[PDB]
């Protein structure tokens, strides 16, 4: 295939979008942006499939062209804009704010946040490099580069960004005992305290994480996102508090809710 591809088959779209099979052949094909194609949520999917504010794609376009949607404090009129982890979506006309946080089953949940909490976000740091007359530079998972960071900030750390200004306010160092979320793999969406990190030089590093219920699970280092310092998260967690129920206890909970209903 000469040149880049511009379409996305519906059955070839990422499964966490929860797209059906009979609506069409194609999928929204996220635009290039701060988040990778497989790990993002396009604006149209969120605005139409998730929130049901629009019934068709044309209605999503009509919504976005009145400049009502803001992603991390900036008006975004692109309906296929890739909104990813920890992004803040603000709709002032109706007055709500959402944070894209993975659910326990590895899907972007509709998570409403208070307007006070919509003024900042947390970003994982991807690399630090010195350039241009010895000025340090940070690169985050959100593709934003910040010059003059705190010298203590190292790779795999987490920084709190004020969305209005774009500057760092504080940070969490990657260390055992700090709370984290898994942003990829089998344990995606799970929240727990880092227990141990084993280093394999020349290969991937494995991080062990223990839930609040005592369950343990491993991931790769690139799949770990520091959420809070110690046991306390710096953001609000979704309704499922990051713990994964087995199918048996999920069925028991569903049956109990059914019995208590009515």
């Amino acid at each position: 295939a000469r040149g880049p591809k511009k379409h996305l088959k519906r059955v070839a779209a990422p499964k966490h979008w929860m797209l059906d099979k009979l609506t069409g052949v194609f999928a929204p094909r996220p635009s290039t942006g701060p988040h990778k194609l497989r790990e993002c949520l396009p604006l149209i999917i969120f605005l139409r499939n998730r929130l049901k504010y629009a019934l068709t794609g044309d209605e999503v376009k009509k919504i976005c062209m009145q400049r009502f949607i803001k992603i991390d404090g900036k008006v975004r009129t692109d309906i296929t804009y890739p909104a990813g982890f920890m992004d803040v979506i603000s709709i002032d006309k109706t007055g709500e704010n959402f944070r894209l946080i993975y659910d326990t089953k590895g899907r972007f949940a509709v998570h409403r946040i208070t307007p006070e909490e919509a003024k900042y976000k947390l970003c994982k740091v991807r690399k630090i490099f010195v350039g241009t007359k010895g000025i340090p530079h940070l690169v985050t998972h959100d593709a934003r580069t910040i010059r003059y960071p705190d010298p203590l900030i190292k790779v795999n750390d987490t920084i709190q960004i004020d969305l209005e200004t774009g500057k760092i306010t504080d940070f969490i160092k990657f260390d055992t005992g700090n709370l984290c979320m898994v942003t990829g793999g089998a344990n995606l969406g799970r929240i727990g305290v880092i227990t141990n990190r084993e280093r394999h030089p020349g290969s991937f590093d494995v991080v062990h994480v223990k839930d609040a219920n005592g369950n343990s699970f491993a991931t790769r280092l690139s799949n770990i996102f520091v959420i809070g310092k110690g046991n306390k998260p710096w953001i609000s967690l979704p309704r499922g508090k990051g713990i994964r129920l087995t199918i048996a206890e999920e069925r028991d909970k569903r049956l109990a809710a059914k019995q208590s209903s009515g």
């Binding site: 010059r147 003059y148 705190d150 010298p151 203590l152």
Partner: peptide, 30 residues
Amino acid sequence: KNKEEAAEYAKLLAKRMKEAREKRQEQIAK
């Protein structure tokens, strides 16, 4: 903006190096 950012980072760097030097002094004491 460049001037202000440079000044603020110079202050922060001075503080960080002072803390690192104090820790080095504590190490050399032991």
